[PDB]
Design a protein around this ligand. Structure first.
Ligand SMILES: O=C(O)CN(CCN(CC(=O)O)CC(=O)O)CC(=O)O
Ligand SMILES: [Fe+3]
Length: 498
């Protein structure tokens, strides 16, 4: 029974299974479990539910539950528990109605001691995938409710999962202890200590001094130069994942110079992503040329990349009326200079390093990118108002992409909707997104996703940049390195020391 030291930039949170920030998804994933399980091969399999049947119309799903599960406090996991959980989520729809499964779900019914029926307004093909997510459909013991729910807080974070939160010291650490009565396989580590360490350089120093045993994260747990250093050094186990969600810039089709398709195409041709990846990222993320990568369901449709071609960029601009005067000037149209704001939350280190590169590259073709690294509330306001020319965004990874991310494009207060608002075919895109989510036919789903994604690509709504990757670094004694099936999943339970 070894112990593991991990680190994270913030405390894990109160670990409410049905709330969002400040609860950390990786930690929710350690404690609470779903009815069905997303696998790395894209399939969804049994988990708390052993099997399930679907009505002829696809509107009702009856889930047969395992009869050998208990919450970490000894309380029985059963159909009434699953109902009480779903009900408190459905009593709080405004927090959850970003998730289309919630919108479709009507009721949960107990139809046997270990059998739960879920009823929907319509057949909804992402049902099983969205039931597998970190939240909100995972299960706390109902004895832990307050006011008959979880929206106003919980007594203690009691789940059925392989780890229990046993100690929290604010600003210092969160300690997870192995659930010794877990229903599934027994984890080889008895304890994970998550040390709260906010700065990535501080994290590397702590790692080299033997105070942290494993680095693992998708948002730069250490700097790219440090990852490079570690790997060359050749004493550690180091690995990068396959491509996860895509980092993009969204270009505003409804606002500023990006209203012009020719400007958006020029932008996509003038940024040297290969150099950006080689210099600032040291090869730790793969170039992305489309909104979704080839490994996303329905997304491998053979779209043609916008090649790095700065001369072509120049030409398109010229024929849009954006012309220069002397060599090295900012282009002008109708006595209006080609100035474009690029927005990102100012504490986001990776985004900042990328923004600076985008600025330099576009400057070579006559575009004055004005960098705006702002405070979070200021950025949020811009997103809803559509008050941006270019703004950083990213997809959601597995198993959210593409269904849940395209679904969010429909919401007026979102950056993706605001950026797409100037497209002549915006209404048709949104109507097709709705149709694809409730389609019961695979041929139709392929055609629909192909059309939606082709329009977004051919209209140059996005500047795709890179594929996010989980980076992992570990002393060899920790053992083999495995990546979670989901972006947010850190499989501590699969680590086997030595
Ligand atoms: O974070 C939220 O409150 C809701 N999420 C919903 C989609 N999420 C999953 C989640 O938060 O449960 C994507 C993500 O955070 O990775 C929206 C977002 O990140 O834009
Ligand atoms: Fe989220």
């Amino acid at each position: 029974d070894p112990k593991l030291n991990f680190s994270w930039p913030v405390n894990v949170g109160p670990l409410n299974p049905h709330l969002y920030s400040p609860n950390q998804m990786f930690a929710q994933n350690m404690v609470y479990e779903p009815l069905v399980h997303y696998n790395a091969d894209g399939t969804v399999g049994p988990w708390l539910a052993e099997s399930w049947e679907a009505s002829q119309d696809g509107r009702s799903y009856t889930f047969k539950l395992r009869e050998d599960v208990k919450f970490s406090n000894g309380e029985v996991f059963d159909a009434a528990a699953v109902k009480a959980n779903i009900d408190t989520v459905l009593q709080n729809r405004p927090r959850h109605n970003w998730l289309e499964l919630v919108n479709q779900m009507v009721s949960a019914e107990v139809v046997g001691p270990y059998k739960v029926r879920i009823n929907l307004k319509k057949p909804y093909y992402p049902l099983l995938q969205e039931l597998s997510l970190p939240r909100p459909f995972r299960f706390i013991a109902p004895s832990q409710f307050k006011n008959g729910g979880t929206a106003d807080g919980i007594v203690a974070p009691i789940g059925t999962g392989p780890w229990k939160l046993t100690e929290t010291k604010l600003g210092e650490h969160d300690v997870f202890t192995r659930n010794d009565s877990y229903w599934g396989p027994k984890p080889a580590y008895e304890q994970i200590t998550v040390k709260v360490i906010p700065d990535p350089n501080t994290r590397a120093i702590a790692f080299e001094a033997g105070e942290i045993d494993l680095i693992y994260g998708t948002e730069g747990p250490i700097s790219p130069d440090t990852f490079e250093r570690f790997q060359k050094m050749g004493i550690y186990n180091t690995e990068l994942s396959e491509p996860l969600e895509t980092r993009v810039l969204a270009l505003n089709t409804n606002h500023g110079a990006t209203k012009d398709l020719a400007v958006r195409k020029a932008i996509n041709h003038a940024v040297d992503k290969d150099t950006m990846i080689a210099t600032v990222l040291y090869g730790t993320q793969k170039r992305a040329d489309t909104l979704f990568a080839d490994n996303v369901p329905y997304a491998n449709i053979g779209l043609k990349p916008y090649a790095f071609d700065p001369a072509l960029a120049a030409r398109l601009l010229d024929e849009a009326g954006w012309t220069a005067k002397a060599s090295g000037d900012i282009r002008e149209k109708d006595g209006q200079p080609l100035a474009i704001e690029l927005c990102f939350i100012g504490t986001d280190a990776i985004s900042k390093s990328m923004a600076e590169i985008v600025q330099a590259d576009l400057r070579k073709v006559g575009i004055d990118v004005k960098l705006t690294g702002e405070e979070e509330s200021s950025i949020y306001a811009r997103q809803r108002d559509g008050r941006f020319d270019m703004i950083f965004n990213q997809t959601w990874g597995a198993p959210y992409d593409p269904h849940a991310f395209v679904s969010s494009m429909r919401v007026p207060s979102h950056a993706d909707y605001q950026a797409q608002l100037g497209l002549p075919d915006k209404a048709k895109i949104d109507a097709e997104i709705g149709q694809v989510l409730v389609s019961t036919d695979e041929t139709a789903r392929q055609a629909l996703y192909k059309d939606i994604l082709t329009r977004l690509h051919e209209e140059a709504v996005y500047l795709p940049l890179t594929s996010v990757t989980a980076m992992a670094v570990a002393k060899p004694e920790v053992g083999k390195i495995t990546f979670g099936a989901m972006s947010s999943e850190i499989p501590f339970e699969k680590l086997t020391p030595k």
